[PDB]
């Protein structure tokens, strides 16, 4: 029997949000015990600065440039899957649960999908057997004329909407959702143990603004509401882990914890996380935007309380989980995800690159201890003047710029070991600069010449495709009449 | 019945983010990380000043630099210390920790940097310590021995050489055998004292002070460049110091504490300076990154292993604690800032104390619970900033990180450290949370200030002629130099 796979994917949590990672308030005892009982990655990365493209990247093991989760409307624009998006995960893409099904797995997604809300993009059409969660954010409450409230699904059909059947109180921050997500996870694990190997994609989002937590966890954190959520998610994760041990299926269960992108610094200090020593956060390709916590837990297989400086990618969990199940990745396409079993079980290292993409643009690349910035950008001057700051309290001369700066000819290079916060660019005349530049450009060109970008899915929007009448609305009497609209270019 | 040994490990310019367990990315401190696992970690511990001298005086006196005299009044809120030319130093009126420990039968050794005065009257062996190996000053140089003399290294009463002479530091490569000698002094001392007398060891190393140094086997081993090389060596050294305690079965009767005298020296980063993790600025300022420090406590069988305490802790506390460990009481004829942390260390209790952040003659900021109020703000002057000196590289918080000494006494800048450790978002002045904190914090501040009679300042006068031209012992080595003709004058800070 192949080992169970449990993937814990957080939403907008940063490198500095875990106790073991150096959070001052030390409010994550369960994840801290998971680290003590496993392996911690200090140099792990997501595939994009925001949600959709990263989640697609996890599930495909492929860069958003490859899987289609980007825009070409303008260069280097962050795009995702809002209610009005026309595109979504293509049928050509082979998702992890589709393939695991080859080894007898039974797979469940809990929480946020974000790979398309239209019927053709349903996760049960793309490998998953069961679902409880929403295809979108939990933003609202909407007036149901201009926008409809975001639906929560059980499997094929909606069972309610956020701010309706599933209340979120914005004043207090109260919502029972994380407790339902917990309960879905426990029950699933209970039905599958000793029957079939299971795959659980536990993609919670209480940590996405507007932040929420159940009543018992409200006002317990020193981090305000955002920490309340983090404390609940942590408590929940402890209980998920204890159940694996109480069923003696822990030795045959591989669990991995990570986050889809950096902390949402527009929402700090109350509703956003911490990126620790790193620069900026979500929306950018600086370290704080794409470096993530990363714990691996597999009693008896992964040696307890170790550290690996393996450069890791969220995409690696695609290939690894396949290797865990004794399968091979698709041989008819480029696969970015690497098999990390040699790192996880033997403590070996691998000299791989980390590409930092923002929209249609490779912004930056990391080999070893060096990161080269070919393009730099926080947000435009117009957005900055309107009070949107992606890098609050932070300003690095000629690095954190409000123009999309072209450094393709003469990249801004950092030594991450010496300078994790990307504060001091290497001098252009130095030998260390030259050695890195050659090493990094070599891998980048190679990548780019072998790269045929996919057709972009995130270019077109249409008011009429919003969740007006999800499947199951008729029986609940919750279908809404949609407005009259045409498809047009999304304004990003 | 014998009182436990006390080992104090004091670092020089290391920051809150320089330890693995504290969240350093490269994870290069396995021994301190094992000391944490085997003890108690403090996330909310503080030094008493933004730089060396005043903090080290504060540790040893258990008293604020405003009280013990380690400050200047030449201008308001100026960082001052004890350079070679300083006239003052630790006053005779001050009762230092080793003086007092000697009341419980202790034998005390300082290893490394003193920095409480280099003149004969200020010698550590005149102030409680039985043995010394180290320098009274920095390891800056090499000086031409006409304008300035090279800084001496002492064994006990007499100099045994000078830096960049008998004790070479290579600036090109960063090589120096000093940390290995400091280690050896510590091991040997522990070996002679065990099963004889209870011992106090003040291990104040400084490889991590610019210009940074490490022994050959540790050079080029860190991903943090030379500064990390040092940090790796100090760590390895600390591992061996700990292993010796266990190999002599005196570890259960030995209380060890690790900390740093101030924040990372961000003018020297990225090659020669540390990391302050999530916090703002560093050394020279009273922002969190300047005065919040790592803090581990290790005492097998007494301090429960691998715990965390959010007790607001001060470097001064080690004065009162070490006394309490020895079954003694602090001086009752003077104000004592250091608190006894045995209830925190051995029982896990909490205590609602204030943290005062002084810069020179000015109380800049104060912290109670989760709130910090800035009464004054300042990084450095505009003139110094334009000359390339930046205390907060890559950091700028609007109307908080300012190049003028800003007066917020009427309307303090308040932060919630739990929510906003990097001091980025001041609380709104109209909020109830602001009002609650302001009253709570001003209450303790006034109380402190009304009971406060500042000491006369020791760091006001300098004199070229008092530099280490002819230290005791120079005559036999033939190393005495002729001093220049000068008068005492006001130090330019
Ligand atoms: C699921 C979700 O909320 N998606 C968010 C989107 O709503 C918005 O906040 C965006 C900011 O660019 O980031 C995405 O990750
Ligand atoms: C022992 C030592 O070097 N003292 C230093 C001093 O030399 C200088 O660097 C100063 C900067 O303000 O900081 C002090 O801690
Ligand atoms: C959560 O569930 C409890 C019942 O156990 C209920 O009292 C509470 O109102 C619920 N809160 C929300 C926001 O639905
Ligand atoms: C960032 O710093 C540079 C150089 O000090 C300066 O020109 C610019 O005004 C600063 N920008 C912001 C947004 O703070
Ligand atoms: C340091 O010590 C070793 C002997 O242990 C010696 O060979 C070496 O020359 C010394 N290095 C310096 C720079 O003094
Ligand atoms: C810091 O930020 C402020 C406000 O944005 C700006 O006016 C100033 O230029 C910055 N300070 C420096 C020294 O660059
Ligand atoms: Ca996200
Ligand atoms: Ca210092």
The secondary structure of A397-413, three-state, reads CCCCCCCCEECCCCCEE
B99 Cβ contact partners less than 8 Å away, ≥ 6 residues apart: B127, B128
| Separation CA A90–CA A69 (nearest Å) | 10
Tell me the structure's resolution in angstroms, rounded to a single decimal.
2.8
State both tokens at B138: 């920095």
Q: What spacing in Å lies between the alpha carbon of B177 and ligand 5's midpoint?
A: 6
Residues comprising chain A, all counted = 492
Percent of chain A that is helix, strand, coil (3-state, to 5): 25, 15, 55
Q: Could you tell me if B15 lies within 8 Å of chain A, comparing CB atoms?
A: no
CB atoms < 10 A from the CB of B252, how many?
12
Burial status of residue B372 (CB atoms within 10 A of its CB: 0-12, 13-18, 19 or more): buried
Peptide bond into A111 cis (omega under 30): no
* Best residue in B419, B422, B424 for a mutation probing chain A (most A CBs within 10 Å): B419
A42 alpha carbon, distance to own chain's centre: 17
What is the Rg, in whole angstroms, of the alpha carbon atoms belonging to chain B? Answer: 21
Q: Could you tell me if B421 lies within 8 Å of chain A, comparing CB atoms?
A: yes
Which contacts of B157-163 are long-range, i.e. CB under 8 A and separated by 24 or more positions? B157/B123, B157/B125, B157/B472, B157/B473, B158/B471, B158/B472, B158/B473, B159/B471, B159/B472, B159/B473, B159/B474, B159/B477, B159/B479, B160/B473, B160/B477, B161/B477, B161/B479, B162/B468, B162/B479, B163/B135, B163/B139
| Separation CA B234–CA B226 (nearest Å) | 13
DSSP A482: P
State both tokens at B41: 């970690």
Q: Which residue has the tokens 């393709």?
A: A408
CB atoms < 10 A from the CB of B83, how many?
17
B440 Cβ contact partners less than 8 Å away, ≥ 6 residues apart: B368, B369, B371
User: What are the φ and ψ backbone dihedral angles of A130, each rounded to 5 degrees?
Assistant: -135, 150
- In chain B, CATH 3.40.720.10 sits at 1-353+454-493
Q: Could you tell me if B26 lies within 8 Å of chain A, comparing CB atoms?
A: yes
CB atoms < 10 A from the CB of A146, how many?
9
CATH superfamily of B1-353+454-493: Alkaline Phosphatase, subunit A (3.40.720.10)
With H, G, I as helix, E, B as strand and everything else as coil, classify residue B201.
strand
- In chain B, CATH 3.30.1120.10 sits at 354-453
Say what the alpha-carbon torsion angle A15, A17, A19, A22 is, to the nearest 10 degrees. Answer: 50
CB atoms < 10 A from the CB of B306, how many?
11
Assess contact for B304 and B41: CB atoms under 8 A.
no
Q: How does strand B107-112 pair with strand B131-134? A: parallel
| Separation CA A212–CA A161 (nearest Å) | 16
User: What are the φ and ψ backbone dihedral angles of A181, each rounded to 5 degrees?
Assistant: -55, -45
CB atoms < 10 A from the CB of A435, how many?
12
- In chain A, CATH 3.30.1120.10 sits at 353-452
Could you give the C-alpha distances from A120 to A91, A110, A324, B283, in angstroms and in order? 9, 19, 29, 58
| Separation CA B257–CA B277 (nearest Å) | 21
Residues comprising chain B, all counted = 493
| Separation CA B207–CA B233 (nearest Å) | 9
| Separation CA B466–CA B119 (nearest Å) | 7
**Method by which the model was determined:** X-ray
B492 Cβ contact partners less than 8 Å away, ≥ 6 residues apart: B462
| Separation CA B131–CA B151 (nearest Å) | 19
Which run of H or E residues covers position B112?
strand B107-112
Beta bridge partner(s), residue B155: B133, B158
Query: Which residues have CB under 6 Å of ligand 2?
Result: B 51-52, 79, 81, 113, 115, 138, 140, 209, 284
Q: What spacing in Å lies between the alpha carbon of A364 and ligand 6's midpoint?
A: 27
State both tokens at B182: 């400091």
Assess contact for B404 and B382: CB atoms under 8 A.
yes
How far from each other are the two terminal CA atoms of chain A, in whole angstroms? Answer: 47
Half-sphere exposure of B263 (CA within 13 A, CB side): 26
Which of A177, A166, A252 is CA-nearest to residue A212?
A: A177
Nearest CA in chain B to A277: B277
Q: How does strand B371-374 pair with strand B413-416? A: antiparallel
Which of A200, A186, A191 is CA-nearest to residue A236?
A: A186
Query: Which residues 368-387 of chain A have a CB within 8 Å of chain B?
Result: 369
Which run of H or E residues covers position B155?
strand B152-155
Which of A238, A267, A329, A248 is CA-nearest to residue A30?
A: A238
User: What are the φ and ψ backbone dihedral angles of A354, each rounded to 5 degrees?
Assistant: -115, 115
DSSP A253: E
DSSP string, B367-430: EETTEEEESEE-S--HHHHHTT--SSTTB--TTTS-SS-EE-SSS-EEEETTT-TT---PPPTT
- Ligand 6 atom nearest the C-alpha of B401 is 1
Q: What spacing in Å lies between the alpha carbon of A252 and ligand 5's midpoint?
A: 53
Could you give the C-alpha distances from A296 to A5, A253, A321, in angstroms and in order? 11, 11, 12
Assess contact for B136 and B154: CB atoms under 8 A.
yes
State both tokens at B379: 């990084």
Angle between helices A224-246 and A29-36 (to 10 degrees): 50
Is residue B177 within 6 Å of ligand 5 at its C-beta?
yes
| Separation CA B138–CA B389 (nearest Å) | 20
| Separation CA B86–CA B429 (nearest Å) | 43
A294 Cβ contact partners less than 8 Å away, ≥ 6 residues apart: A40, A41, A44, A256, A257, A258, A312
Q: Could you tell me if A416 lies within 8 Å of chain B, comparing CB atoms?
A: yes
- Strand extents, DSSP E, B230-354: 254-260, 292-293, 296-298, 307-308, 313-314
- Strand extents, DSSP E, A243-353: 253-259, 291-292, 295-297, 306-307, 312-313
| Separation CA B413–CA B376 (nearest Å) | 8
| Separation CA B374–CA B452 (nearest Å) | 19
User: What does the angle CA B151 – CA B157 – CA B163 come to, to the nearest 5 degrees?
Assistant: 20
User: What are the φ and ψ backbone dihedral angles of B305, each rounded to 5 degrees?
Assistant: -75, 140
Ligand 5 site-directed mutation target among B175, B215, B216, most atoms within 8 Å of CB: B216
Q: Which residue has the tokens 């495909």?
A: A60
The reply to whether residue A277 touches residue B280, judged by beta carbons under 8 angstroms, is no
The answer to whether domain A353-452 has CATH 3.30.930.10 is: no
CB atoms < 10 A from the CB of A489, how many?
11
State both tokens at A37: 């009982």
Burial status of residue B353 (CB atoms within 10 A of its CB: 0-12, 13-18, 19 or more): middle
| Separation CA B131–CA B154 (nearest Å) | 10
Beta bridge partner(s), residue A283: none
A19 alpha carbon, distance to own chain's centre: 20
Which run of H or E residues covers position A99?
helix A96-100
Ligand 5 site-directed mutation target among B177, B181, B182, B215, most atoms within 8 Å of CB: B177
Which run of H or E residues covers position A161?
strand A157-161
Q: Which residues of A touch B226 (CB under 8 A)?
A: none
The domain made up of B354-453 has a fold known as Arylsulfatase, C-terminal domain (3.30.1120)
Which run of H or E residues covers position B188?
helix B178-193
User: What are the φ and ψ backbone dihedral angles of B451, each rounded to 5 degrees?
Assistant: -85, -5
The reply to whether residue A224 touches residue B25, judged by beta carbons under 8 angstroms, is no
Assess contact for B314 and B293: CB atoms under 8 A.
no
Nearest CA in chain A to B426: A269
Q: Which residues of B touch A24 (CB under 8 A)?
A: 43-44, 278, 417-418, 421
DSSP B115: -
| Separation CA B334–CA B330 (nearest Å) | 9
User: What does the angle CA B238 – CA B239 – CA B240 come to, to the nearest 5 degrees?
Assistant: 90
Angle between helices A51-60 and A316-324 (to 10 degrees): 30
Buried b or exposed e, range A294-324, using 16+ CB within 10 angstroms: bbbbbbebbeeeebbbbbbbbbbbbbbbbbb
| Separation CA A87–CA A94 (nearest Å) | 16
CATH superfamily of A1-352+453-492: Alkaline Phosphatase, subunit A (3.40.720.10)
User: What are the φ and ψ backbone dihedral angles of B117, each rounded to 5 degrees?
Assistant: 125, 135
| Separation CA B85–CA A302 (nearest Å) | 58
State both tokens at B84: 């070679």
| Separation CA A184–CA A133 (nearest Å) | 10
Is residue A55 within 6 Å of ligand 1 at its C-beta?
no
| Separation CA A442–CA A449 (nearest Å) | 11
Of B271, B394, B420, the CB nearest to A423: B394
With H, G, I as helix, E, B as strand and everything else as coil, classify residue A107.
strand
- List helix spans (H) across A220-286: 224-246
Which run of H or E residues covers position B133?
strand B131-134
- Strand extents, DSSP E, A168-233: 198-203
State both tokens at A233: 């998610």
- Tell me the torsion sign for CA atoms B365, A26, B397, A287: positive
State both tokens at A324: 């865990």
CB atoms < 10 A from the CB of B486, how many?
13
| Separation CA B358–CA A76 (nearest Å) | 47
- Ligand 1 atom nearest the C-alpha of A50 is 15
Beta bridge partner(s), residue B109: B131, B201
Q: Which residue has the tokens 């007006």?
A: A468
Could you give the C-alpha distances from A179 to A56, A282, A489, B178, B248, in angstroms and in order? 25, 26, 39, 57, 52
Q: How does strand A253-259 pair with strand A4-10? A: parallel
Closest ligand by atom to B184 CA? 5
Could you give the C-alpha distances from B391 to B227, B247, B267, in angstroms and in order? 17, 43, 6
B371 alpha carbon, distance to own chain's centre: 24
β-sheet with A44-45: strand ranges across: A291-292, A44-45, A312-313
| Separation CA A162–CA A147 (nearest Å) | 13
- List helix spans (H) across B296-380: 317-325, 342-347
Q: Which residue has the tokens 């790269």?
A: A451
Q: Which residues of B touch A424 (CB under 8 A)?
A: 269-270, 393
Q: Which residues of A touch B224 (CB under 8 A)?
A: 417-418
Could you give the C-alpha distances from A44 to A342, A418, B54, in angstroms and in order? 16, 17, 41
User: What is the number of helices (H) and of strands (E) in chain B?
Assistant: 12, 21
State both tokens at A411: 């990249």
What is the Rg, in whole angstroms, of the alpha carbon atoms belonging to chain A? Answer: 21
| Separation CA B468–CA B136 (nearest Å) | 10
Closest ligand by atom to B262 CA? 8
Assess contact for A2 and A103: CB atoms under 8 A.
yes
State how far residue A46 is from chain B, nearest Cα, in angstroms.
17
Could you give the C-alpha distances from B323 to A70, B103, B331, in angstroms and in order? 64, 10, 10
Q: Which residue has the tokens 């997604």?
A: A109
Percent of chain B that is helix, strand, coil (3-state, to 5): 25, 15, 55
User: What are the φ and ψ backbone dihedral angles of B336, each rounded to 5 degrees?
Assistant: -125, 115
A223 Cβ contact partners less than 8 Å away, ≥ 6 residues apart: A25, A27, A230, B418, B419
- Ligand 5 atom nearest the C-alpha of B215 is 1
CB atoms < 10 A from the CB of A120, how many?
11
């Amino acid at each position: 029997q192949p080992p169970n796979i449990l993937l814990l994917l957080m939403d907008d949590m940063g490198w500095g949000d875990l106790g073991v990672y150096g959070e001052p308030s030390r409010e994550t005892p369960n994840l801290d015990r998971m680290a003590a009982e496993g392996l911690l990655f200090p140099n792990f990365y997501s595939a994009n600065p925001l949600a959709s493209p990263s989640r697609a990247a996890l599930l495909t093991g492929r860069l958003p440039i490859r899987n289609g989760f980007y825009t070409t409307n303008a260069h280097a624009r962050n795009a995702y899957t809002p209610q009005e998006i026309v595109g979504g995960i293509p049928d050509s893409e082979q998702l992890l649960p589709e393939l695991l099904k080859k080894a007898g797995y039974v797979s469940k997604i809990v929480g946020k999908w974000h790979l398309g809300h239209r019927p053709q993009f349903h996760p049960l059409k793309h490998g998953f057997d069961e679902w409880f969660g929403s295809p979108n954010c939990h933003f609202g409450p909407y007036d149901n004329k201009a926008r409809p409230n975001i639906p929560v699904y059980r499997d094929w059909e909606m069972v309610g909407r956020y701010y309706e059947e599933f209340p979120i109180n914005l004043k207090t921050g109260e919502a029972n959702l994380t407790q339902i997500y917990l309960q879905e996870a426990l029950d699933f694990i209970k039905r599958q143990a000793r029957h079939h190997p299971f795959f659980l994609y536990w993609a919670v989002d209480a940590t996405h603004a507007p932040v929420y937590a159940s009543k018992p966890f409200l006002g317990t954190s020193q981090r305000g509401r955002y920490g309340d959520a983090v404390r609940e998610i942590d408590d929940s994760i402890g209980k998920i882990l204890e159940l694996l041990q109480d069923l003696h299926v822990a030795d045959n269960t591989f669990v991995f914890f990570t986050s889809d992108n950096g902390a949402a610094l527009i929402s700090a200090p109350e509703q956003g996380g911490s990126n620790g020593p790193f620069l900026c956060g979500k929306q950018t390709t600086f370290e704080g935007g794409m470096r993530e916590p990363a714990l691996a837990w597999w009693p008896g297989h992964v040696t307890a309380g170790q550290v690996s400086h393996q450069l890791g990618s969220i995409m690696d969990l695609f290939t690894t989980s396949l290797a865990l199940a004794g399968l091979t990745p698709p041989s008819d396409r480029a696969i970015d995800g690497l098999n990390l079993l040699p790192t996880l079980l033997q403590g070996r290292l691998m000299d791989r690159p980390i590409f930092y993409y923002r929209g249609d643009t490779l912004m930056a690349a990391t080999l070893g201890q060096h990161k080269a910035h070919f393009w730099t950008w926080t947000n435009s001057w117009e957005n900055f003047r309107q009070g949107i700051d992606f890098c609050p309290g932070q300003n690095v001369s000629g690095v954190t710029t409000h123009n999309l700066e072209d450094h393709t000819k003469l990249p801004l290079i950092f030594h991450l070991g010496r300078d994790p916060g990307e504060r001091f660019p290497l001098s252009f005349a130095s030998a260390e600069y030259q050695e890195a530049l050659s090493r990094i450009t070599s891998v980048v060109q190679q990548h780019q010449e072998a790269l045929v970008p996919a057709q972009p899915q995130l270019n077109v929007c249409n008011w009429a495709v919003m969740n007006w009448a999800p499947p199951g609305c008729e029986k609940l009497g919750k279908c809404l009449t949609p407005p009259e609209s045409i498809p047009k270019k999304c304004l990003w």
